[PDB]
Amino acid sequence: VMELITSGDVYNRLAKSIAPEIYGNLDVKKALLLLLVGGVDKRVGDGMKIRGDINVCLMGDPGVAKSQLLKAICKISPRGVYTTGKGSSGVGLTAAVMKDPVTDEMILEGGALVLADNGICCIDEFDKMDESDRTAIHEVMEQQTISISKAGINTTLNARTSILAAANPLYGRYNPRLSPLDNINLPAALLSRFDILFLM
DNA sequence: AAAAGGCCTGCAGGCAAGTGCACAAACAATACTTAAATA
């Protein structure tokens, strides 16, 4: 580590060595560096916690190869996990609980997110994620708290996670005639939870 | 085998494309009125 700190340019060094198979769009790789490092927080004590994690989202077309960037990152991040928008249903991605009848206890069956705790959740096709399911993610902005009160079980399960998403303009490639945030169908109550938006 | 939690798809939630068009006013010159020139 001392070797690295001495080797200099470490910031832009990693900013280059990230995604070391693709050249260009340096800025988004910069943001990905900032995400994977994360590592801040404010448990204010005797009061409100503050998520010190990053929620960066994209926007573009297949030509951007953003799914490759996701493979890159959540391969580079320890604990990282990948998925798609429609890959896992709502209850599939958040959590599924079984009231174990043997000891009548709580079993958590690997919600994508809880698996994602202390890791970066890669997400594709976030536009088609069936906004009725956008509630779970929307829940994630309020990090490390996924509360579920159904089927005789009413308890919480925390997931320290940073979410990386990949979206598409609804009109395909892009609508020049229309303003931004039209291309980006996401209701502002989602952007405001995101920190960085990178339309490409 | 059916009744009770949960989640998937048929009905339509909806509205801009868009043409018809039924409102209006001068409209272009109607139809007729009234002063003048000639026997």
Ligand SMILES: Nc1ncnc2c1ncn2[C@@H]1O[C@H](COP(=O)(O)OP(=O)(O)OP(O)(O)=S)[C@@H](O)[C@H]1O
């Ligand atoms: N800067 C780049 N360096 C190397 N390959 C690139 C670069 N930009 C695009 N590509 C290529 O673009 C191809 C398209 O990748 P895809 O995963 O299909 O795109 P994408 O990530 O799905 O974008 P979305 O999610 O459809 S918007 C990849 O296989 C890359 O090889």
